[PDB]
Design a protein around this nucleic acid. Structure first.
Lengths: 272, 272, 272, 272, 272, 272, 272
DNA sequence: CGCTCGCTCGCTCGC
């Protein structure tokens, strides 16, 4: 009775696409109606749903999800290639670097840092790329005590606001460096931050260690060695935008199907 | 009688169209009397009411509920066109700006800010906009500790004056432009904030962030870049207010069908 | 057995009219004996009483309970007419203004505040007018941390004391101008505040808006436009109190049977 | 089980002739033991005690309760009369004023202040009069925004000390003249205040209106008109105390059986 | 099973006289073992314990508990008499004052003030006097007026510390003079204050009432006239105190066997 | 069925030896398995464990349990004597002081403070003294809600760290001064606080009243009078440590079999 | 039915090769299905896991787990030997020092300071050392309210980063020196500090006690005595890391089977 | 077959 129901719920959760509350309400909306019409208690169902969500968040990361089912042939039908050609960089090399960084094949340099203000248009593209996946964790830097709130234990962790001070750079260098360690949040919560690809998209200089109020350059070499620098030249135009998911998947599949030379340095040269 | 009673209550709520207790008491109050005379437990009724409210609040976008079956018909039929003609502006540009702010076509301009005294023409417009939508919210600054309370399950979020200290400004700026994040201010407050348009109506200047008890300047640039400037010079006459929903729907349909150029600035131009 | 008894109790409670505790205890006498001899209901009885109170309050108008059966003919018999003649004001114009303000069809001035001497006699008249109705809610400024508290389950709102700040004035201006918004009174308690005729009677100047901890005369024109200015000059002696209901009903009937032209000015015509 | 136990308790209380709680606990010691050994029903007992207190406060105020069937006989048989004769005040006029204030025959003059220093002779009399009534009320002025807390349906009001700030004076002025106002409670609602005889007995000067931290003289005319003035210069000597009930009842009967004409003014004449 | 256990507990509380918790836990512990081995129901046991406590507290008197009948046969035997003789006080007068204060036959003077530090010998003497009786009670004062242990129907009130602000000064004189006062504990607890003798023991100056941030000298005479100042400047030699019950009984018998004349005032005539 | 099982569990717990949770888990752990196989209610098991702990604790005070039953007959047969000879101090005087402090002979002095560095030998002595008793507690300043939260009938308390804030010193002086007080440490847990022997072992100066961040010399006299002081000279010896209960028992026996003079100061006499 | 499942789980955790619940769930496929079909309670499973962990920690120490049964058999084919040859250090001397430090017989030496940047391969070695042991804890030291919370008797603790304030120096010395004390973890939890070594691997300075914003240099001798200086400023190669447990066990066995000179110093220079 | 008290489970507030 209970075991069969739990197995059926696990099978229905595995053979579907439920993640957040909005997606679950938009997809299968009859579950809430059935629960309201039946009994007002589903502890086993809630536990099974939580287990399925944890298995989906810890199972597939980004490489098993960004693999498309059909590679595109027309390179002019993608906005990413046009943006890369207008900015002044190689599109194939950038795609290969992105595929190598998202697969966990770089090593210590597992953090991509961007440059530019909020009027460049890259923030919307980054938000769309972060929301196109299932689990997503935004790094809300609002206090100087706990930098990671609800962004731990997800799929893709990205930062869109907040500046790291001098009291958090020592922890960021060990968290974003790509090492598995168990860290306790508040008191009754102890998670394990694993090595995942985290993209940093801000405006200020991330390598400048802001020691409270001033700026002290005492450990910029490790932050520069374990960090990247991808600058954007051409900004976003008017009447052009809205990053979807099928085009991104096709671009990822085309970049993975044709791998070329991939470099490993700090400052990216003007190639292409 | 449990499942059958819940099904009958759901059917009566779907056919009668009741949202809260006030609407049910004002309209057909026979279902509530029957439920009170029959069983004594109100947990199922509360769960059904919460489910109905959630289904009514989450279903589509904020601009999808303002488009009626009537097309153009008559352009001049509301007080907004008369106010724009008396002050000296264009109606087409204002309609395009409203359609872009309600649909999120600009990306950054997703908040309407007002300025001027109460005897000029803003309080009546705000009251009409709040009364035109039943599922509207208002962030009343009653306390200086946890002012953000009723912020979920609503579309039109109101905003008034008050000593807004530096605390939740960083979380409100990410929600006023278009994002999805949770903000906790007390005990049970874990709830995701959906992207919806927020209207700001105040008598004084709300562009400067207050530092507890004094008006200072710290985060005025993001509020000026995300908010929209709406200056006024004409005085408030007589018989202003009480706008029906049909005129608002006709204006929204005319603005969505007849669109001009796309602009992105703080002030309002008189072109068109 | 239990359902029939509950239905009989609901019918007896609906066919008796329960508005207060003391009146219900002085009128009915076998209800307590029946409840002690039967079961031990509480939640259902409270819900039924709340529903009956809501249906009795929000269902009709406040001006329908003040109509009389015969109009008054002697102008030197009622105390209100004598007070209006001794104060030096028009009686017919004042009656027409009161009838227009009580019907909710006057405009933006839905509140009437008086400013006279200390020991005059208006306090007894205000208390009699507040007690003449069944439901009456006073604005007691006991807890300074919360704004409006005693304002649900009533209709007649009377202000006695309490220093209103800027936030309280801004929250009250949204309801005193004819709008409808949700005002919070505790920790998560939203309720629809409908527009009703609020009568203000105190000795302090209500035009001076306090700016939290200091005094700043900044909200004068809107406070003067959204209200009137009814001052007194004559003083009453001993044996002038004890306002009944037949005289008030006769005065209301005489004012409704003869309605003149209503004006709109802050300064009343001192003629009498 | 509960209804039968409540009926048995009511029958035992009616057959035993119990009125208060302390006397019933000190005398009828078997009823409490039986209630503790059987079912524990405290809510029903509290409701019955509240109903008995309300019935005692409604029927028979102070003159019909503190008036014995036997006469006074000798004039020298009361401490209050001896104190009034030694201080120089009129005894018949004071008795008439007390009978008029305790009977509701004064109208707006329902306030009596007793001016005195430290150990003079009025504090002990006030304490004895407050302790002679089992269900009396005391002004617990221990907080700023927390005025009354235990004075609902109390015909006897005791006052010892406590300077009220400018935030409850407007509510106290309307209640001291025999009115009916709703005060803000410390919980979240508001109780009902009935027109009972409230006496004042402070130590400093009650004529100065404490408006927060200064003295207000512009609004002192109504407080002076709706108040009395009593002075006591005779110090409390040894072998003069112990106020009982038979002497007070005899004094009340002698004052009611011989009423004189007193001038209704601010001060009290000592003629006679 | 439950009735027999309740009867055994009542018998052990009545005839056995089990009042202390540590002694009852160190002696027989069969009731706790039975309650742990049985179910979790303890309403009857709690009611029996409350009834036993009420029966033990019902008794205003300390002479039958402290005074005995065995002869001493010597002048000096207890340490209290030696301390009083070394400090500079009368022996017979002190014994008469103690016998008059322990009997509760004074009337107005029902307080004992002790001047000096806590290391002199007043705290140890108070602890010995409280432990010499079988039923006693102490209530500390840490915050303002919330920490109240148990003192209903007692005869000795403890006062180790507690700085009362300008709020309860007018109520303490009436509560410690010969009347009652309202008590506010947590929430669902309300009682009165009977005329019991409180032993005041402080080290600073209690005559200067702190009014929040300053001093007050307007009602100190009323609190000083209803008390007995006892100067205790002679400190101990090397760990003095620790009086048992036999020594206290012998001292009480020696003080009662030699009674002299003692006046009723505030200043102690130390003439011996 | 339940009573017999509870009696069997109590007998099995008494016929073994309960020390703490870690010792009970390391020794016999079949009680939990038996309780899970028999019943399922954890309340009965918790009550049985509490009864067993109370029965094991109710045996002796502290001096009769810490003193061994084996004589030495020589002054050179313990590590304490060697440490005292190396650091330069009197052995007999130190043993007498320890016997007087552990038995409650000084009265006002009931705390032993060990001053010096961490690598001296005081930590091992403190650990041995804490492990020599079965039930031992510790007071740590980790939580900012309650500093003295470890007080559930503890007979030996050890101090290892924690600042001395201006708040708990007044409560600690009444417990460390030898007086029958009942100070509450949590919420509704005002038990009989007896004068238990407390030991302090820190490296910094514990006589500095840290009032936030500075140091105010105003609450150091009672802590210095109720505490001791010992200035060591020898550091931690290499290859020497881990004192057991045998050395403590031998030292206690040598101090009890050889009693000399007893002083009452900080630095004791070392002549001998 | 749960007793048999608990016994089977305990047996599988004891003799089987399972440590946590994840390994037991991933091992047998039918056991997880049976546990899901039985019940949903996890308290018994958690208790069994805690008992197994306690039995494994009390039975086998860190020496029996870090040392293997077979040696490496190669004095020039290992990662540790290559790192020592590249950094300039002795192999046999380093192995002897490691065996002496990881034995728990030095007295106070329980940590090891390390320098150099994060690109020297120390992070990979720390991750391998943390993954080679089952029970691994972290030092979450960020806020100034809670000191150490993730230390519940961990066998291998790794120090990450954090500004060590000047207040917990005594608590750190009592934990790293083998001082057994019953210190509280947070508020509602407590444990016993056992003598276990904690590894230290970071990039900042451990001697600089950063007290919030300043730097305290008074405490340095205990940190230098209870630590081991290890240089790591020499740059190594790239594309290395990923150390398993077999190599570490072989190195430990080779160091234990061939012991040379062992000293108790601290400043370990690059010998050889 | 009906009245009543003890064992056990459910709604709700404090910390």
């Amino acid at each position: 009775k209970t075991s069969a129901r739990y197995m059926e719920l696990v099978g229905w959760l595995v053979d579907k696409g439920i993640t957040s509350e909005k997606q679950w309400i938009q997809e299968d909306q009859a579950s809430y109606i059935s629960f309201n019409a039946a009994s007002n208690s589903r502890s086993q169902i809630k536990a099974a749903l939580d287990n399925a969500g944890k298995i989906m968040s810890l199972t597939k990361t980004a490489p098993d999800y960004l693999v498309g089912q059909q590679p595109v042939e027309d390179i002019s039908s993608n906005r990413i290639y046009k943006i890369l050609e207008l900015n002044g960089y190689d599109p194939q090399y950038a795609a290969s670097v992105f595929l190598g960084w998202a697969t966990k094949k770089f090593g210590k340099r597992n953090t991509i840092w961007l440059f530019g203000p909020a009027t460049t248009g890259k923030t919307n593209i980054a938000e769309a790329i972060a929301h196109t996946v299932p689990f997503y964790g935004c790094v809300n830097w609002t206090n100087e005590n706990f930098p990671f709130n609800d962004c731990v234990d997800k799929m893709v962790i990205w930062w869109e606001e907040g500046k790291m001070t001098a009291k958090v750079v020592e922890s960021a260098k060990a968290i974003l460096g790509g090492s598995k360690v168990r860290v306790d949040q508040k008191c009754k919560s102890s998670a394990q931050i694993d090595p995942t690809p985290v993209i940093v998209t801000s405006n200020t200089n991330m390598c400048a260690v802001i020691d409270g109020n001033s700026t002290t350059f005492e450990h910029q070499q490790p932050l520069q060695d374990r960090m990247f620098k991808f600058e954007l030249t051409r900004r976003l135009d008017h009447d052009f935008g809205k990053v979807t998911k099928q085009e991104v998947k096709d671009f990822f599949r085309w970049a993975k199907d044709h791998v070329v030379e991939v470099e490993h340095e700090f400052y990216v040269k003007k190639g292409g």
